[PDB]
């Protein structure tokens, strides 16, 4: 039992997306006291459409920044975003509690994978 690239359930996809935004941010800005996780974990799971919209602004800004320097990862992450955001039809305003459980699994699963290598 591990990460399934084919689950195609919306709250699972949202969890994966969250996890990889965390990872990309990490590489963006070293040395931060607090991660986006610590800041937004709860909110994200309660109000998808609310926040998700917001975060992508900053992510855009960052990837804009990061092309100057020769270093890359971040093109793999931009592709990973672009896959998950194409599979997600739309952003729910809110999720049933039981669904907020499944969101945690997609996050953890995805994280572990990225934890490797």
């Amino acid at each position: 039992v591990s990460l399934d690239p084919a689950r195609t359930d919306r709250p699972y996809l949202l969890g994966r997306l969250f996890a990889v935004l965390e990872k990309a941010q990490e590489d963006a800005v070293p040395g931060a006291n607090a991660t986006i996780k610590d800041r937004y974990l709860a909110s994200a799971s309660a109000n998808p459409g609310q926040v998700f919209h917001m975060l992508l602004k900053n992510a855009s800004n960052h990837t804009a920044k990061l092309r100057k320097d020769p270093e890359r990862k971040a093109i793999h992450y931009e592709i990973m975003m672009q896959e998950i955001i194409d599979n997600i039809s739309d952003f729910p305003v809110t999720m049933s509690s039981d669904e907020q459980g499944l969101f945690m699994i997609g996050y953890y699963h995805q994280r572990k994978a990225l934890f490797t290598k």
Binding site: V29, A32, N33, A34, M54, K57, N58
Partner: protein, 286 residues
């Protein structure tokens, strides 16, 4: 403990040009913003430090005018000095079983130290000295409208360390705000001053400092910074005479009608002031 006799409230306007007013520890060193809207922000703590600096500069160590939290002060030794000046051996956290002893320390440190007398202090560590609230409070400063920070690349042609690619051109960067305008609110309460001895000469000194804040803090990182307007509301009695939010509404700032592109000078805005209700006196120091 003589203290002021009225309730005060005020608003302040200041400006920045090609600079970094307040950096963000969590964002590299990016200027602080509101993610959702993109407005700017400035912490009160910054302003407070500025004020302390100014005072220190001005007074030059005169008794009743020391600063407790000097830039590199060892705070437990400074509490221990306040303690031992009131004959106390150091002890932690709370006020002693006899709270009176740390209250003497409080009295002494309020007596001598201006900024404690003003802003109060937690004033409590593994050497206690008491607790204080302070009669003076401030809020966050907020940009009048959205701000778009830039950042620039710079090159050290010489290098500090040895390099393998050799001399090598090595680049850092700066973050900069083209232009922006800020607003700040504040309060003063008579009852606490009655408890701390916050006097009127203190108040005049305070205002003087506040006007001349920026003059002494010129630096590489900070651009051109200046104070523009200062409005003071004074009530006629020991307690309030009107709601605060109503008073702050009397001041309104709008884009100067001749200004259409992105703001780039103080002339791009128009500032207006209304009349003061019956129970309040409004005077303008700037």
């Amino acid at each position: 403990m003589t203290a002021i006799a009225n309730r005060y409230e005020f608003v302040l306007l200041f400006d920045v040009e090609n600079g970094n007013p307040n950096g963000d520890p969590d964002a590299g060193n990016m200027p602080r913003i509101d993610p959702e809207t993109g407005h700017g922000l400035v912490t009160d703590v910054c302003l407070k430090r500025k004020i302390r600096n100014h005072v220190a500069l001005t007074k030059e160590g005169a008794e009743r005018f020391n600063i407790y939290i000097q830039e590199k002060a060892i705070l437990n030794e400074t509490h221990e000095r306040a303690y031992t000046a009131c004959d106390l051996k150091p002890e932690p956290k709370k006020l002693p079983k006899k709270v009176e002893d740390a209250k003497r320390v409080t009295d002494w440190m309020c007596t001598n130290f201006y900024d404690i007398r003003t802003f109060g202090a937690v004033m409590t560590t593994e050497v206690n000295c008491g607790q204080v609230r302070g009669p003076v409070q401030m809020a966050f400063a907020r940009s009048v409208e959205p701000v778009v920070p830039q950042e620039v690349s710079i090159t050290r042609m010489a290098v500090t360390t040895k390099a393998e690619a050799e001399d090598n051109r090595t680049m850092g960067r700066k973050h900069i705000v083209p232009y922006g305008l800020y607003v700040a609110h504040g309060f003063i309460s008579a009852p606490l001053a009655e408890k701390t001895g916050f006097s009127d000469e203190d108040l005049t000194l305070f205002w003087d400092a506040l006007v001349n804040m920026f003059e002494h803090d010129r630096s590489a990182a900070r651009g051109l910074m200046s104070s523009r307007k200062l409005i003071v509301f004074k009530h006629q009695n020991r307690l309030g005479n009107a709601p605060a939010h109503k008073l702050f509404d009397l001041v309104k700032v709008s884009r100067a009608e001749g200004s259409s592109g992105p703001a780039r000078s103080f002339a791009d805005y128009a500032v207006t002031v209304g009349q003061a209700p019956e129970g309040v006196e409004v005077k303008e120091m700037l």
